[PDB]
Amino acid sequence: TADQMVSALLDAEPPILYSEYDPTRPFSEASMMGLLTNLADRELVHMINWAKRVPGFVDLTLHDQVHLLESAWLEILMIGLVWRSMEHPGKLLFAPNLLLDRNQGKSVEGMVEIFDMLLATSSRFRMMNLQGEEFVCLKSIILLNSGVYTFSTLKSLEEKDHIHRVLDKITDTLIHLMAKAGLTLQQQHQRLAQLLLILSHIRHMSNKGMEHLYSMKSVVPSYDLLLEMLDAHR
Amino acid sequence: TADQMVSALLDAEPPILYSEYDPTRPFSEASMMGLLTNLADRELVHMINWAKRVPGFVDLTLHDQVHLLESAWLEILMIGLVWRSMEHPGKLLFAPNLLLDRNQGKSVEGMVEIFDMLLATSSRFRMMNLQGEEFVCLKSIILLNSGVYTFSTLKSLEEKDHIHRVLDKITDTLIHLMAKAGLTLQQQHQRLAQLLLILSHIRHMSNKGMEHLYSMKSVVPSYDLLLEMLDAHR
Ligand SMILES: CCCN(C)C(=O)CCCCCCCCCC[C@@H]1Cc2cc(O)ccc2[C@H]2CC[C@]3(C)[C@@H](O)CC[C@H]3[C@H]12
Numbered sequence: 001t002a003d004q005m006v007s008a009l010l011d012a013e014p015p016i017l018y019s020e021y022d023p024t025r026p027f028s029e030a031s032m033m034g035l036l037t038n039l040a041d042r043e044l045v046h047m048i049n050w051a052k053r054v055p056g057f058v059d060l061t062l063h064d065q066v067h068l069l070e071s072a073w074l075e076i077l078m079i080g081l082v083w084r085s086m087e088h089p090g091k092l093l094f095a096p097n098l099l100l101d102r103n104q105g106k107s108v109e110g111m112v113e114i115f116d117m118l119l120a121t122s123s124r125f126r127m128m129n130l131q132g133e134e135f136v137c138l139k140s141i142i143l144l145n146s147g148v149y150t151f152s153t154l155k156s157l158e159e160k161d162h163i164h165r166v167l168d169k170i171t172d173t174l175i176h177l178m179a180k181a182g183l184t185l186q187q188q189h190q191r192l193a194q195l196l197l198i199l200s201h202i203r204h205m206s207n208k209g210m211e212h213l214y215s216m217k218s219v220v221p222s223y224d225l226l227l228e229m230l231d232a233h234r
Numbered sequence: 235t236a237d238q239m240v241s242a243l244l245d246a247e248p249p250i251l252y253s254e255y256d257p258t259r260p261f262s263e264a265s266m267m268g269l270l271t272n273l274a275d276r277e278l279v280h281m282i283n284w285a286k287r288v289p290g291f292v293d294l295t296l297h298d299q300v301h302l303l304e305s306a307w308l309e310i311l312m313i314g315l316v317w318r319s320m321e322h323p324g325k326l327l328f329a330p331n332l333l334l335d336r337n338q339g340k341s342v343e344g345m346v347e348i349f350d351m352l353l354a355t356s357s358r359f360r361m362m363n364l365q366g367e368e369f370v371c372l373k374s375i376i377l378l379n380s381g382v383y384t385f386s387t388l389k390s391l392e393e394k395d396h397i398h399r400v401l402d403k404i405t406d407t408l409i410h411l412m413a414k415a416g417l418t419l420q421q422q423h424q425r426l427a428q429l430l431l432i433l434s435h436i437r438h439m440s441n442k443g444m445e446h447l448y449s450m451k452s453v454v455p456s457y458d459l460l461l462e463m464l465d466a467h468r
């Protein structure tokens with residue numbers, strides 16, 4: 001049911017991790033990229049656990065699970081960051097001990113442009129009063145949607161049909177949440193659209209972020225890493 | 235009204251332009267990039283005329299009109315291409331005299347990857363049976379939405395509020411179209427979501443296309459070009 005979908009997603013939420021650095025040492029000696037890389041690397045392991053709990057995800061082939069996570073990982077990191085930063089105007093809560101403003105983004109060439117986008121997205125979330133139940137629906141939508149247009153064998157046709165069925169169930173769930181909040185039918189469809197259009201901007205920001213990461217010529221999980229992490233034993 | 239919005243958008247549609255090349259000359263001697271650049275350059279002029287007819291667009295400042303078109307131009311070109319290609323499986327109808335398959339995209343390094351995405355998007359449009367009235371709504375949404383998160387003066391706050399009001403009116407229009415087609419309330423909100431999620435993929439494809447164009451180090455309209463074209467006399 002829609003209420004069961006909501007509880008499942010909320011129950012699956014990953015933990016909020018801390019940055020790893022000597023708090024009794026001067027900040028200017030740290031590698032900003034080192035801290036951010038190390039944080040994301042640890043978040044990615046919990047990402048895989050969360051993804052396996054998104055209803056419908058483990059019904060797909062391992063190959064298609066990997067394709068979806070390879071497309072979506074940075075969008076999923078970024079929507080979590082924007083959500084964890086919503087109540088910190090002007091700052092990005094990478095971790096509770098790593099709350100950064102835009103001037104701190106200037107320590108890495110090209111990064112302040114990305115921080116500005118993330119900050120503006122968190123502002124948009126605040127303006128709309130995004131609720132946590134909506135947040136978990138949108139994050140699941142990113143996981144299922146971001147790689148689905150870039151997979152026509154029979155099995156692929158079946159995998160795409162299943163993804164679109166799950167996506168439709170999440171839509172039904174978002175509408176149900178909004179009807180419960182007292183929105184009119186018109187406000188429900190307007191708010192659904194506003195939320196989904198924000199996903200376009202998250203995609204944009206992920207593309208700009210990935211371009212920035214690739215420009216360091218080093219900071220990106222490989223196909224084989226994600227495959228090994230998703231291909232678990234019992 | 236919603237019906238008036240639909241008629242206004244349909245009436246504003248740009249013409250379908252032809253590629254410029256000697257049809258009595260061998261194809262292998264043409265510059266593929268030359269043909270594609272020259273086509274897009276001519277489409278951009280008609281783009282500006284169309285944008286000025288999207289309800290609400292000319293109410294914005296010239297500066298914000300330019301920002302929106304600078305963000306959105308390639309997405310708007312690409313959604314038109316995908317729409318003009320819907321009934322040509324396996325081909326991209328850049329122009330009626332320039333219908334290209336994926337092997338023709340291999341003549342420019344890096345381009346076949348983009349052609350594959352565009353082709354897969356046109357397939358998705360065919361699968362959903364996208365209607366022309368829906369197409370014009372989605373194209374207007376791209377224009378209004380793609381640059382709205384990347385503009386907090388009072389005037390900017392007013393410009394963003396107006397954009398979001400127009401966007402909400404287009405949502406209402408898309409729902410109205412779907413109710414008229416006989417869809418249930420559930421199918422209406424599911425189809426609205428499916429359409430808006432495709433816009434995320436169009437954004438993605440524009441980002442990959444822009445990366446490809448910038449990699450030629452040359453093929454992109456400048457801020458000053460768009461400003462001069464939008465800043466018309468009477
Ligand atoms: C084959 C084995 C592979 N082997 C050897 C490995 O070590 C495998 C590890 C491979 C994964 C390594 C990925 C590291 C990604 C770091 C992302 C970084 C942290 C972060 C964290 C967040 O929560 C939310 C968002 C963001 C990003 C936002 C956009 C930013 C600011 C960009 O502009 C520059 C930095 C970016 C931020």
Ligand SMILES: CCCN(C)C(=O)CCCCCCCCCC[C@@H]1Cc2cc(O)ccc2[C@H]2CC[C@]3(C)[C@@H](O)CC[C@H]3[C@H]12
Pocket residue numbers: 270271273274275277278311312314315328344345348349443446447453454455456458459
């Ligand atoms: C300051 C004055 C400036 N000055 C001097 C000028 O000349 C101002 C002209 C500046 C504008 C020039 C932009 C040229 C853009 C060409 C885009 C090209 C044609 C096209 C047409 C479509 O309808 C739909 C889509 C697409 C694109 C899809 C993605 C593709 C395949 C990429 O992978 C490589 C080619 C791309 C396709």
